[PDB]
Structure formats: C-alpha cells, structure tokens
Design a protein around this ligand. Structure first.
Ligand SMILES: NCCCCCC(=O)NCCCCCC(=O)O
Ligand SMILES: NCCCCCC(=O)NCCCCCC(=O)O
Lengths: 384, 384
C-alpha cells in the first residue's frame, strides 16, 4: 500500500479512472475534457521544411555554429541575454512554438517546486523522507533526509543504464508507462519506488531518477495537489509562458517528474530567467533568493565522484536537482539525456536552451561536443 | 496483412515507433517532439470554479435554458448566428477554450475529408471499397461501394452496444487503445476491420462505427497521408481555428476517426459555418457546393429504419456521415454519444454546438431532452 494520493478529479476513487472505466460516470465528465491523459493522442494542426537559423551576433564569433548544432542533433536552440532573445535555431520540421521532451531537465523544474514549498515552510529538507511519505518505510528512502534526495546523495541499488533492458531504469519506465509493462511489474510509479533498496550509505553522489519521483510524491503529500497541478501552480503558471507545458502521466495520473516534461525552448528559457532574477517570475516569486543562491553555490565537491562529469568539470558538484560545473564562469545547468540543457551563464545574465535528439542517451562523445558548444556560446556573450 | 500505411514519420518502418522503441534512433527525433502520441500526457497550465452563462437574447424566449443545460450534463454550449456568437454556456470547471471529446461528431468531420477528395476526383463513391483498400477483400467491406460506407448502408455483424462488454464496439475500442487489450485481440484498427463479417445485404441503414474507420483508411490510401494529417490538411487548417484539434491514435498512429476527435466548442462551430457557407472556409474551399447540398438534402428515407430516430424524426435519414432530421426546418446534425451535437439550422443561418457528458451513452431519455433543447433554441432564433 502506498497511501493517499491526489484524486485524478474531485471526488474520484483511488486509481480512477482507468483505461477501462473512463467512459463511465462519474469519470466521463472529467475524461471527456482530458482524454489525452488516458489515451495517446495526436495534434490536428490549425496551421496549413527548412531550418530556421537566426544566430545573430554570436555568429561572427562562432561562424560554424549552425554546423555544430547540426552535428549534435539540435532540434531547438535559444539564447536569452537579459530579457532579449539574441539567437535562435530550429531544425527543419520543428517549429519555434513546438514542444520538446526535456528528459531530466524536468528534474530541475521539480526541484524548483520543492524549493517553493521549503520557502513556505511546508517542507523541511533536514527531515527524513518518511516524515512526509511514511509508506516509504522499509525502502532505501527510509532514513535519508529530503535534502539528500534533492542532492542525489543516497546509495541505491538502481542501475541507471538507459540502454540495458535489465536495468532498474527500464523497470521504472515500464511502471510509469514509458515502456510496455511486463507481467509482475509494479502497477504504478509509487509502487515501484517502494521496491528500491540500498546498502544504507549516504553522502556520495549517485544520480538516480527515482529520487525526483520521490520528491514529487512528497510534493503531493504536502500540498494535496496532483504533481501535474503543483508544477503549474508553483512554477509554470507564474512564468507568463506562451504555451502550456505537458508531462507524461502513469496509470494513476502521477506525472513522470524525473523526465517527462515537454515545453517550447522559449518557455524553458523563462525558467532560467527566473533563476537569474533571484527566484522571481512575472507572475510572482517562485522560490526564495536564498534557494537560488544555494543552487548557484553548488553542492559538496567531495560528494561528486562521477568521473565523467569531473573530467570536464574538476570542481563540479550537484545540488537541488541542478548540475553545477564549478567552472570559472560559475555555470550551472539542468541536463537531460540525448542533449537537453537549461544552461545558466550568470556572468552575462544569459540563459541557453538546447534541445536535441542525439542517437545515444549519453556518451563522452556527445557530452564533450554539447558542453563545448554551451561554453563557447557563453564566452561569445562576454563584453569585449 | 493490411498493406501499406502512412509512416508515423518520413522514412519510418512499418509500425514504428512502438512504446518500446521510441527512445531509440531514428525514431527519437520525431518522438521527442510528439511524445503525447506515444504516452498518455497531462497539460501543465500556463494560467493561474463557476459556470459561465451568456445565453443572451434567446434567454428571454427560453428563461429556463441554463437549467435545461445543467439537466443534460452540458459542458459547453455555443450558438453561432451568421458569423456572430450570440449565446454561450460553459459549466464550472470547463473553460471556453478547453477542448472536449466529440465522440461520433468526429464522423461528420471524416465525411468532410472524404468529400474534399471526391471533389478532387481522388475518390469515386460508386467504386467498391476494395478499389482503394484491396486488403479488405474477404471481409464485409468486400462488395459494398464507398457511398454505402458513407451512408451506413451495409449489414454488418457488429453489435454497436456501448455498455455491453461482449460487443464488437468494445473489441473496436480495445484494438484502438480506448480500452485495455485482451490476449488475442487484433493488434490495431486496420486488423480489426478485416475481421468484420456480414450477410452480404446492403441498402438498409445500420449505424456502425467501423464504417468511418474504413473511410479514414481509404483517405490514407488515396492521399498517402496519415489520417491525422489529412484531417488537418483538408479540413482543420482551413478553418482559421483558435486551437489545434486532437485525435486519439492507435499503436500504429492511426487516428480514431469514428469517435476520437476533441476540440473547442467555438472551433467546432467553424465546421458548421463552413457547411452553411456552401463548403467554403476562411482558408479556402473545403468541399464542393454539391456535397453540402447533398448533405442537407438527406439520404434515402426508406433506408432509415431506426425506430428511435424516426420516432422523433419521421422523415429522417442519414447520408455522408450526417444525421438528417427531415423536419420542417431541415435540421441536420453531427451526433455523438453522451450528448455531443454539431447542429445546423439553415433557416436562421445558425450553428448550435452542444458538448456534454450524460452518464449514459445513449437512451431515449437523453435523446428526447437533447433534441428538445436544440429544436427550442433553433426556433428561438426565428424572426418574429
Ligand atoms: N527513464 C527515465 C529517466 C529519463 C531522464 C534521464 C536523464 O535525462 N538523465 C540525465 C543524465 C545527465 C548526466 C550528466 C553527466 O553525467 O554529465
Ligand atoms: N467506441 C467508438 C464509438 C464512439 C462513437 C459512438 C457515437 O458517438 N455514436 C453516436 C450514436 C448516435 C445515435 C443517434 C440516434 O440514434 O438518434
């Protein structure tokens, strides 16, 4: 048993509706207005073939930039300097206002929602996860603090290998509806989380996508809101975004917080703009100045033992669902597999969004190229 | 084997991607921009509780209208007289720009796409279905003409009972992803259609949702477009709609043409406006004047033996995916279960959209109430 969860609609029974019940009352009043939450669905365009390249000023300093974007399978690229869009690129077949899957850049959005609730005093990071989700007793999340979840500092038997069919990541995907269920699989994400185990140690960085879904579960328990609604109320609805974002949901309606958000490049940049504005957005304060400052400051360097990340960023770290380079520019980034970045360059007051589709989830090859582009673009924004 | 189908994206292999392959190249470039087509997904609102009632002029003639709308579980109601919205109602919790499932009003949209292709000379209604879909040989659709599909005049062993778990409608739903698959179920909608049988007779009306999906299959074979794209290119993109529509898709990406479209009430009214404008929309001609005239003229009365429909509309009929009342006003309507109507009142140059969620799919009770409202509203628009 995973305890109380936010109803899909007001008054809904646990787990209702399902794929087999949404046409029945009382579910159908909700389902007929939200069918994409139940059944895969395609857009029928209201609008009746070539890449759009407006790389602007930075083009002079980076003449081959468009080629480098093509080489890294770039779908959308946008640079916001201050409040101004100063460079844009969209591949052939991808419109400026099309949405793109964020993968684990989604985690940085979830951390932001958690931060908002910390500012309200509804979450204390020092408290154990079980203070908010008692049902995680007996799991690897029995003992660790919420901050250790936020900082990915829990040792977990979870193989985060995105191409291994035997890995826990694929079981995670199957539990959440990203892959086809196997017999005996957990029924939903909450159940999957309760199955996770570890040796009990904490304090060393281990990237684990399950951690973010635990954060989303905590958000639900503290607010009583579906994570989908909490993500809107505490973040998205304050951005003055052009479009709604979307998030994949599992069979209970639980949003896939660790990887399942999609949005436009321009709208994602608004999240970066909020961070560089000390936590304030057009619709109000999203998180405290202190929270933003702690993100920019980084996590414990000694906890960060990931050789791949530190080979590129020796003084790098991770905190509050953000990767921190610890480089001379103080760059921090949300990062997702296949080449998604929400990259912050505080020195130039700039945000870089890059949304891509590398053939591979993550290799040193793509990592080197991607970071080379983001760093070069950042430096191109420097006063000369 | 069901033959050639439009690829989900340019160059895609048959049936690709699946739920298990969309993260792999080359599929992921497409999937990351269209994930809602693969995995159920929720909107994260960019906007930060009471019914909106603007029933306007007709309120004086129908003082109790709002109550009657509540009694029939109305979610959205809109009256367009000429080019002007003259009355609107939206229930608490449903915004004016929210989309709503159309159920079989979707069929009237599909018929419109077929009509466009007839005008282009790419479909001849007199030709057998097998002229366009040879793979339907050996099925109940081997022999009948395309027009007989359009007019629902084929005898089929298909129990269109929406609450019977043993009915062909539920098998249809399971094949298309509206319900959970059972072992041994057809893999997709195309396969399901090939399993249908009948005694071979034609000429009498039998409402069968499978007919519309055969029409959509024909559309795909003649255009080479996914039905989702054909619905946009030939109809939706010419309407100057406020929002995209959506349509549920099965595991091959085939749109559920018989029932799966969702859109806003105001945008649906644009379809009615196009019909009353002789087939022309803001973005160009959608169908010929002749096609519209034949819809308004009705089908063969003698074919219409459905006692429920004819008890209300004695001179009623059905043609080209529209229900024709044959009443003194010449009303014609798209109709969907649980209370969806795209209702045309040519006398007053008006369109009535009513989108609802009756607890039951279809009963004489709801039928009587729904039609009573539409007729009363139509008459309230008359010159006095
Ligand atoms: N299957 C659910 C998980 C989907 C999100 C995974 C993801 O995007 N992970 C990002 C890993 C970034 C690693 C950065 C680095 O090592 O340098
Ligand atoms: N399960 C797929 C079918 C969903 C659409 C069915 C539908 O909306 N049918 C409309 C029936 C209208 C009957 C009108 C009458 O008999 O008066």
């Amino acid at each position: 048993s995973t305890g109380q969860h936010p109803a899909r609609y007001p008054g809904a029974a646990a787990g209702e509706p399902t794929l087999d019940s949404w046409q029945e009352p009382p579910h159908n009043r909700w389902a007929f207005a939200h069918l994409g939450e139940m059944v895969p669905s395609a857009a029928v365009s209201r609008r009746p073939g070539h890449a759009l390249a407006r790389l602007g000023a930075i083009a002079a300093q980076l003449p081959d930039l468009e080629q480098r974007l093509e080489q890294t399978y770039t779908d959308a690229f946008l640079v916001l300097r201050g409040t101004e869009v100063v460079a844009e690129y969209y591949r052939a077949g991808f419109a400026p206002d099309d949405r793109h899957l964020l993968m684990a850049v989604s985690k940085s959005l979830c951390g932001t929602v958690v931060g908002a609730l910390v500012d309200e005093g509804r979450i204390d990071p020092a408290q154990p996860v079980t203070e908010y989700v008692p049902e995680l007793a007996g799991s690897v999340y029995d003992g660790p603090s919420v901050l250790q979840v936020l900082d990915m500092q829990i040792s977990i038997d979870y193989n985060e290998d995105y191409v291994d069919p035997a890995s826990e990541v694929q079981t995670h995907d199957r539990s959440a509806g990203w892959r086809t269920r196997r017999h005996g699989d957990p029924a939903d994400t909450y159940e999957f989380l309760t199955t996770l185990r570890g040796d009990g140690s904490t304090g060393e960085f281990q990237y684990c996508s399950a951690n973010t879904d635990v954060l989303a579960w905590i958000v639900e328990r503290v607010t009583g809101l579906r994570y989908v609604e909490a993500l809107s109320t505490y973040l998205w609805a304050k951005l003055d975004a052009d479009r709604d974002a979307t998030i994949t949901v599992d069979t209970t309606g639980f949003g896939f917080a660790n990887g399942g958000v999609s949005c436009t490049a321009r709208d994602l940049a608004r999240v970066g703009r909020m961070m560089l504005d000390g936590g304030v957005a057009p619709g109000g304060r999203v998180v405290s100045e202190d929270w933003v400052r702690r993100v920019l400051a980084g996590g414990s360097h000694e906890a960060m033992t990931d050789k791949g990340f530190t080979n590129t960023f020796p003084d790098g770290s991770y905190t509050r669902q953000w990767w921190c380079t610890g480089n001379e520019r103080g760059n921090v980034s949300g990062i997702g597999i296949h080449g998604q970045n929400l990259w912050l360059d505080p020195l130039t007051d700039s945000v870089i969004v890059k949304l891509s589709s590398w053939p591979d989830p993550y290799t040193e090859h793509w990592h080197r190229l991607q970071n080379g582009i983001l760093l070069d673009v950042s430096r191109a924004l420097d006063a000369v």
